[PDB]
Symmetry: C4
Subunit: 81 residues, 4 copies
Amino acid sequence: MRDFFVITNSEYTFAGVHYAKGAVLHVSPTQKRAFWVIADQENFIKQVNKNIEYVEKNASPAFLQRIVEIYQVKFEGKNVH
Amino acid sequence: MRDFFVITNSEYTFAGVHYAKGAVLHVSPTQKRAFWVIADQENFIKQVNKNIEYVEKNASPAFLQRIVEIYQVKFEGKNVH
Amino acid sequence: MRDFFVITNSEYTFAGVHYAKGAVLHVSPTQKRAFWVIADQENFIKQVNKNIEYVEKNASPAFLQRIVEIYQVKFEGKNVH
Amino acid sequence: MRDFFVITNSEYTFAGVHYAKGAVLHVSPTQKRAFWVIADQENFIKQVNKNIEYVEKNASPAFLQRIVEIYQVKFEGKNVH
Ligand code: NA
Ligand code: NA
Ligand code: NA
Ligand code: NA
């Protein structure tokens, strides 16, 4: 599966990672990695991968759990300030 | 190769895994993994990967063996109830 | 890079593998694997990956070496009779 | 993410690798690898991957650092003369 974005529907911890409400998560099934991007990173991604989709803008913990089940993704927090 | 679905043509064990007739298998060549999805998972996949194809709806064990040969996929059963 | 086919331009050994002239090689950069497919496998691939391209139908050893350089692919022979 | 090209905006060392100004870097998120291609390799890539994009033709070190952050890519120099 291509990379995609989701946006958290509320503030929660999923897979040990705290996410604010409205956190944009970049999900990469090929790399088995999802992480919370800052705005500049979100925008960068859309330069290099212009057709990336926001497939769910109200992602609950149950939605993220489906990503774990289907794509075996390891969720992470931010990797920059 | 992109991810794709197949549907089993009959009830059988393939690669040590029991599949009912009509089992929808999500096949991911990139992750070298195929597994039997439940309906809610099948539907989830079509939200995040809207263009996924059902490339064979009468997949026999011989068809799954081609998937092993070409894509080196490890077949699994369900991962939820 | 997506998977693609090449066809050998002559009979040769490349990366320790013998290929007949006209051997169809399935190349998978994501899996770092290329191998010589039999006709039934070639046809199977076109069912599950209908848009796969034959990007070079006169591939010399030098062409395969570019595949090694760019995609780090391990070349193999047939995996069925 | 699909493979893509960038072109360096100036001469610099990034991740321990020297790049001339105007160096074309082939970036493969799936393989977590980017490297400086020679012209013949650049052209080869466009034969096998005809739709590859030059997503940034003035890539600074900060741009390459985003590639590291988002795609976990290991940068390399040339692999041929
Ligand atoms: Na946004
Ligand atoms: Na179905
Ligand atoms: Na042919
Ligand atoms: Na150029």
